Amino acid sequence: LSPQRALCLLELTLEHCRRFCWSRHHDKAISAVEKAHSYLRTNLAPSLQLCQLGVKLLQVGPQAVAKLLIKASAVLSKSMPPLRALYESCQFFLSGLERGTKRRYRLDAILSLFAFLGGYCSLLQQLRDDGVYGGSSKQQQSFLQMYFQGLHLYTVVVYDFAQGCQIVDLADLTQLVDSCKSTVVWMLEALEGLSGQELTDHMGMTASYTSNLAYSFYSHKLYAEACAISEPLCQHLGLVKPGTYPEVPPEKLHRCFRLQVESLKKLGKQAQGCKMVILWLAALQPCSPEHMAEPVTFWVRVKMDAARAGDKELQLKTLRDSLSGWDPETLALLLREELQAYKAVRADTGQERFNIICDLLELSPEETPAGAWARATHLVELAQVLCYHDFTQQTNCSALDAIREALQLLDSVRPEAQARDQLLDDKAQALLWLYICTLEAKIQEGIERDRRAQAFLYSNIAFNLAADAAQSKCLDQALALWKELLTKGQAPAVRCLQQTAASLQILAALYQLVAKPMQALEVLLLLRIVSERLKDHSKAAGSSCHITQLLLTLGCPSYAQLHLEEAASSLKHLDQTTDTYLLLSLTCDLLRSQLYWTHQKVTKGVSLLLSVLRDPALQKSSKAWYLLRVQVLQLVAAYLSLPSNNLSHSLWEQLCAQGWQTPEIALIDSHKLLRSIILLLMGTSFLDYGENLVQKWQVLSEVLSCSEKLVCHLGRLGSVSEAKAFCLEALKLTTKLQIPRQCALFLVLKGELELARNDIDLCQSDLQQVLFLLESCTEFPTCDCSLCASPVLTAVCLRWVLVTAGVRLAMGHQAQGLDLLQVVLKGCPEAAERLTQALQASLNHKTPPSLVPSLLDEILAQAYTLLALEGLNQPSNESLQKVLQSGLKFVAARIPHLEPWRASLLLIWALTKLGSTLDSICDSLSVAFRGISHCPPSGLYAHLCRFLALCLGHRDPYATAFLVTESVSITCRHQLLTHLHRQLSKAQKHRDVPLARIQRLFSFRALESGHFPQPEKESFQERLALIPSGVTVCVLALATLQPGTVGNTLLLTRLEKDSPPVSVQIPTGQNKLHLRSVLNEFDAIQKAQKENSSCTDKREWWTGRLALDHRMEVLIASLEKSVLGCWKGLLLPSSEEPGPAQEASRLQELLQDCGWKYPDRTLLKIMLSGAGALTPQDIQALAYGLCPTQPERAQELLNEAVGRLQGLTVPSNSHLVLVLDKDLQKLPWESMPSLQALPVTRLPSFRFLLSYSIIKEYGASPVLSQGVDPRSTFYVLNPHNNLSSTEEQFRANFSSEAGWRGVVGEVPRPEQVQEALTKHDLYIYAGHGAGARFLDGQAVLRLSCRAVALLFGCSSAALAVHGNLEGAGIVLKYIMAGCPLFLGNLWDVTDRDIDRYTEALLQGWLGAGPGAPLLYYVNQARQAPRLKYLIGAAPIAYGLPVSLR
């Protein structure tokens, strides 16, 4: 064919090949191949051959195919006229390759394709370079499209091969490395000298191609070459600073840079990565304040990773330094973005944030009106960074100065319309942080005051300072700003809405702490609004959980259900298997348990709560989990305060098996856990550093709430010492934080606790303090300013009007106290109604079912109680049956909650009905008793047990004895339970069977299911079965018919081992001498002693002493004669010998004939065991009492019986333990004539004898088992150096004794007195009182007590009885710690006489020999001192008999 014909032949041959492709035919292609074979002779011939080869390759669709591809490239290489024909041929060859995507390609095939593609590319580029190609715009575009089309196909093959590339084929990917990087070079050259639109569109695909090309290696851990692939583009794109590519999608440019920065950062090279982020932002130079965010996040990621590798010098390379020449505004925005991204990390970036804020302050020109805004914003950020870790080496500006400068700048700013939202945001945030840093200033000021050491009404009136109006106003305005920002419903358009969310969280926490709960509720509503706007369901669920918890803390449980359902709905949209979901699910379960608790569906609630308590996710180490355990423990306490009829029995067992046996224990563990959290905040690897800020103001609010619960509970139980301890701790915290409302609450609580102990002066002081604080708080019917609007302030006000009425009644005003109580009666309803309306308006609902029953119900119940106790003293038959019926109805609507008050009201009703009716009283009081048996009020439990054992007596012997047994030492029982729990805690933490056994013994709800008196009676029979041999237990108790009186009828209950409980009632209300009169005479003697010891005339002094001693001996004689009378052998031992038993049987029958109701044998068996000493008048009274109808022959028969039983012996080895009431413990019963030869000790309750037995079973009590050693004794002789008369003689005799290591003259260190109680057998204290100063009740309760305590001081073993509270004293803490025997005085004694007594006791006991009873020598030494009844009847023993070893 001629040149032109050959050119046409090439076109025709290409058309023939295209025709074969048009129908994808092969036989037709073979015919065209035959036509080409006919034309075989040219330049087009190689081209036709390539097309034929492409057809053969298409037919193949392995090694030969690879060879064919290489062969095609080789011939094409020689051809590239021929090259022009080779293009059309290469297109045909590429067409075969296009249909040859078998995906089963190896680097060799890809290399062969790369060879062909490179050859085609070289020829195509040369053809495009030819002026003619460029001359035709479309023609150059066509070749340009062809090149890019080929490259797109190439990367597809590369990614297909990369997908085929596996762990083993990674080597093959490293083979394709060469062509890939070379490809990028070609692509960039293709963009040279290109028209804007053509260049930008090609730039997009160019970047896209390498992004796909680089991603493959990055997706297989091959950064080096991935970086080599993207390096040219990133450099070229970054270098061209002129924004010549405005259209090129930022989204693409991002990917390529993103890949290289990650490749370098995942391979360290943080420095290179930083430069790549600088190049990244260089490319996005004229972009929007949006696309610049991702580079900045990568900057902070490379910066934070640098710190991990010690690359501190990366922090040295800052953005302002790196981006030297950048428009100010742009650099300021970029540093804002860096500040936010630093706020996003979790690894102590305070200094970095400070650097960014300093540079932003230096860059923002204060001159411009649009620079004052940036000044103020960077200033509030500087305040945030300074209230954290103040920097005294920089700035020289204080935080409270920075924030005030910011607030002034903001007050100077004026927005237009688009920035008013940002203005409200930053203003509210500035006000919030103003409050925060004023509070930090207060904290450091208090720290300086307390540190000032050199070498509290005034404090309250000083801390008040009238500064509440200044600080609370700023939060009240921040709330309004946030509200006007977020309530419009439109989009907010603020900088970071996340910052608004965090600030709202802090504001809700702060309001909760300042005790403004309704404001916190509004803030949480706004946080829920913002949380939906941001599509963060974690925060929506948390906000709903908090709203529900805060609504349950108040009265209304109806509105809590809506928000719990909302929290669950938000929980649906979470990932699950994530700590956020686990925590919010447990929180919602807890809230539902509490909703059941308040809705009286208690068994489902306990099921839920036990499901929560047994989750291994509740114990993982994190602060939110600790807050959840706090709420769990408060709910567990709320469930332990319910009566046992509300729940099943196995439910109670599994509930108490979790480790908390009483609400007091649960609440003190809550308090302990709340403290352990603060040790974590106010200090880790910052993993839990996410919510520390909000948690720091949540933990303090929860501490104050836990303290309010732990103070209102322990004071209602009568344990006022611990209650005042927690109240003082909380008052100290609140004066530290300078919060008026919380300290007002706690001062009213302390006032009530002091009124409990009959301290009218301290109570009136606290009342005036709270009146001052409440006048401070109020901004000075339906609205009483800030008081009425707030529920906490109305609560504190009604508690004021309650404790003031209590004081006004204690001093004796009556009318004023009743008027105050009737004011509290009209106050709680209206307060609840206004809280109802306020809550409805705040949450914006309709019709809340029932009013809010918060603490207003409890204070109204206490008002009903105190108003029913005063109708007894004024029984005018009027507003007594109308104030007790209303109180009973009120307290009977809320059944499971107000239970102590219903028990009080039932007891008052019984006392009103006292004067069938006995059965009515018994059933009413049994209702009440079961109402308070689980956790008794100590003061009500005694009155309820003894009234129920007086009505029910001899008609039910065991039940009557059980009630008398539980009416003594209730507070000591509570305290022992708490102490045992603390012992278990510390013993577990340090590394017990007897501890758990004693706990079961003292438990209040270790009973079985039963009716009214049966399970109690069975547990009591077990306890009776537990008594040791040779011990008689007489429980003397005063049956009080009024709360707050003394009483006259003595309940005497005798307890032996294998004998029924013998009880008796001794009504000493007409016996001339009385028992009230005996106590009055004892008090008179003790008052006259101190009023006489001031005289200096020795003769009158000794005369007064003698008169008091005669009065005292008369009193002791009167106790035995009139107080006990005939019923005084109940304290004497029992005759082991037969004789009393047989006569007991005969007399039982014969007197039963005479008219003796309730005939019993053991009573006569113990009353005839002492017939030797029985006088005819005792027999006369006994007979005339037992058999009233036919008394004469009852006497004659009794006379015959005692005459027949004239000769007898009381048991040698025997012992009597006297369990006395709080009022009869001060009388000296151990010195009555009958009990002088008899060993006699005291114990608080009958359970303590069993506890001593249980401890003896296991050990830990060597003295009560082995014996006191004569050596091994620590003494404290005259530590205050007052008494030298003793000091000299006692010094001589003590130093004379062997093995006695003690002090004399000096106060002992607490450590050696601790070792004295612990490591010794005897602790002879000759001094002031009962140690007290160097060794107090808490220090010994914290200790084990091995030694016998011979504390020879004034009122050493006396118990102080204040008000209607039970006796308190250090002897209780000694025998609660395991002291076998505690000897001490009972009233005030003198010097040399008590020295004579002590000398006799120590010379008799010590020196007698091994196995010498001590109680024998306390009565043998009672005859040595001169005043044998005034300072001889004073020494008293507590515990079990001891003996020298």
Partner 1 sequence: YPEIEKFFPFNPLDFESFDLPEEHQIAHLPLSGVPLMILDEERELEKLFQLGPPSP
Q: Binder to partner 1 among 74, 309, 914, 1360 (CB under 8 A)?
A: 1360
Q: Does 346 bind partner 1 (CB under 8 A)?
A: yes
Q: Binder to partner 1 among 419, 733, 760, 851 (CB under 8 A)?
A: 733
Give the span between the Cα atoms of 1333 and 868, in whole angstroms: 43
- Tokens, residue 932: 């308070």
Torsion of CA 930, 931, 933, 934, to 10 degrees: 120
Task: Please state the closest distance from residue 991 (CB atom) to partner 1, in A.
Answer: 18
Q: Binder to partner 1 among 200, 285, 297, 322 (CB under 8 A)?
A: 297
Q: Does 201 bind partner 1 (CB under 8 A)?
A: no
Q: Does 1392 bind partner 1 (CB under 8 A)?
A: yes
Task: Please state the closest distance from residue 186 (CB atom) to partner 1, in A.
Answer: 16
Q: Binder to partner 1 among 1337, 1378, 1380, 1439 (CB under 8 A)?
A: 1337
Q: Binder to partner 1 among 77, 721, 822, 1214 (CB under 8 A)?
A: 721
Contacts of 1132 (CB under 8 A, 6+ apart): 1166, 1169, 1170, 1210, 1234, 1238
Contacts of 737 (CB under 8 A, 6+ apart): 439, 442, 443, 513, 700
| Binding track, positions 227-256, relative to partner 1; x by CB under 8 A | ----------------------------x-
User: How many other β-carbons are positioned within 10 Å of the β-carbon of residue 950?
Assistant: 18
- Residue span binding partner 1 (CB under 8 A) among the ranges 33-41, 798-806, 1091-1099, 1192-1200: 1091-1099
Site for partner 1 in 86-115 (CB under 8 A): none
CA angle 817, 819, 822 (to 5 degrees): 110
Q: Does 956 bind partner 1 (CB under 8 A)?
A: no
Residue type, 531: S
Give the span between the Cα atoms of 472 and 1067, in whole angstroms: 63
Site for partner 1 in 312-341 (CB under 8 A): 340
Torsion of CA 877, 878, 882, 888, to 10 degrees: -40
Q: Does 1292 bind partner 1 (CB under 8 A)?
A: no
Site for partner 1 in 484-503 (CB under 8 A): 496, 498-499, 502
SS3 helix, strand, coil % of the chain, rounded to 5?
Answer: 65, 5, 30
Q: Does 208 bind partner 1 (CB under 8 A)?
A: yes
- Residue span binding partner 1 (CB under 8 A) among the ranges 212-220, 241-249, 559-567, 1022-1030: 212-220
Site for partner 1 in 863-882 (CB under 8 A): none
Q: Does 1099 bind partner 1 (CB under 8 A)?
A: yes
- The secondary structure of 1320-1365, three-state, reads CCEEEEECCCCCCCCCCHHHHHCCCCCCEEEEECCCCCCCECCCCC
Q: Binder to partner 1 among 66, 177, 232, 388 (CB under 8 A)?
A: 388
Q: Does 207 bind partner 1 (CB under 8 A)?
A: no
Q: Is 1303 helix (H, G, I), strand (E, B) or coil?
A: strand
Classify residue 323 as exposed, middle or buried by CB count within 10 Å of its CB (0-12, 13-18, 19+): middle
User: How many other β-carbons are positioned within 10 Å of the β-carbon of residue 913?
Assistant: 12
Q: Does 1430 bind partner 1 (CB under 8 A)?
A: no
Nearer to partner 1, 672 or 954 (CB): 672
Nearer to partner 1, 142 or 1093 (CB): 1093
Contact 482, 505 (CB under 8 A): no
**Run of H or E including 765:** helix 760-777
Q: Does 344 bind partner 1 (CB under 8 A)?
A: yes
- Residue span binding partner 1 (CB under 8 A) among the ranges 195-203, 722-730, 860-868, 1042-1050: 722-730
Task: Determine phi and psi for 519, rounding to 5 degrees.
Answer: -65, -40
Q: Does 1282 bind partner 1 (CB under 8 A)?
A: yes
Q: Is 722 helix (H, G, I), strand (E, B) or coil?
A: helix
Site for partner 1 in 969-1028 (CB under 8 A): 982
- Residue span binding partner 1 (CB under 8 A) among the ranges 258-266, 464-472, 1037-1045, 1437-1445: 258-266
**Run of H or E including 1276:** strand 1273-1277
Give the span between the Cα atoms of 818 and 838, in whole angstroms: 30
| Binding track, positions 498-537, relative to partner 1; x by CB under 8 A | xx--x-------------------------------x---
Site for partner 1 in 658-717 (CB under 8 A): 668, 671-672, 674-676, 678-679, 681-682, 689-693, 696, 700, 703
Furthest-apart CA atoms within the chain: distance in Å:
168
Nearer to partner 1, 434 or 1031 (CB): 434
In eight-state DSSP terms, residue 42 is -
Q: Binder to partner 1 among 40, 239, 309, 447 (CB under 8 A)?
A: 447
Residue type, 171: A
Q: Binder to partner 1 among 257, 1393, 1429, 1437 (CB under 8 A)?
A: 1393
Nearer to partner 1, 353 or 427 (CB): 353
Task: Please state the closest distance from residue 94 (CB atom) to partner 1, in A.
Answer: 16
Q: Does 436 bind partner 1 (CB under 8 A)?
A: yes
Give the span between the Cα atoms of 174 and 1330, in whole angstroms: 89
Q: Binder to partner 1 among 201, 992, 1113, 1391 (CB under 8 A)?
A: 1391
Task: Please state the closest distance from residue 628 (CB atom) to partner 1, in A.
Answer: 20
Nearer to partner 1, 25 or 266 (CB): 266
Give the span between the Cα atoms of 321 and 355, in whole angstroms: 12
Give the span between the Cα atoms of 207 and 233, in whole angstroms: 7
Residue type, 866: L
Task: Please state the closest distance from residue 979 (CB atom) to partner 1, in A.
Answer: 11
- Residue span binding partner 1 (CB under 8 A) among the ranges 117-125, 213-221, 650-658, 1143-1151: 213-221
In eight-state DSSP terms, residue 618 is G
Nearer to partner 1, 167 or 679 (CB): 679
Residue type, 130: D
Q: Does 590 bind partner 1 (CB under 8 A)?
A: no
Task: Determine phi and psi for 119, rounding to 5 degrees.
Answer: -60, -50
Any bridge partners for residue 1436, and if so which? 1384
Nearer to partner 1, 92 or 342 (CB): 342
- Tokens, residue 175: 């083979």
Residues with their C more than 2.5 Å from the N of the next written residue in the chain, i.e. before a break, are: 41, 61, 80, 455, 683, 780, 915, 991
Contacts of 1164 (CB under 8 A, 6+ apart): 1140, 1143, 1144, 1147, 1148
Q: Does 1090 bind partner 1 (CB under 8 A)?
A: yes
Nearer to partner 1, 266 or 813 (CB): 266
Which residue do the tokens 């390529």 mark? 256
Contact 1371, 1345 (CB under 8 A): no
Any bridge partners for residue 599, and if so which? none
Q: Does 456 bind partner 1 (CB under 8 A)?
A: no
Q: Binder to partner 1 among 1066, 1358, 1379, 1444 (CB under 8 A)?
A: 1358
Active site residue 496: no
Q: Binder to partner 1 among 1283, 1303, 1326, 1379 (CB under 8 A)?
A: 1283
Task: Give how many residues touch partner 1 by CB under 8 A.
Answer: 105
Contacts of 27 (CB under 8 A, 6+ apart): none
Q: Binder to partner 1 among 1328, 1404, 1413, 1424 (CB under 8 A)?
A: 1328
Give the span between the Cα atoms of 898 and 900, in whole angstroms: 6
Catalytic, out of 51, 256, 712, 1354: 1354
Of 754, 737, 666, residue with least CA distance to 706: 666
| Binding track, positions 825-864, relative to partner 1; x by CB under 8 A | ----------------------------------------
Q: Does 1279 bind partner 1 (CB under 8 A)?
A: no
Q: Does 258 bind partner 1 (CB under 8 A)?
A: yes
Any bridge partners for residue 1304, and if so which? 1277
Residues catalogued as catalytic = 1354
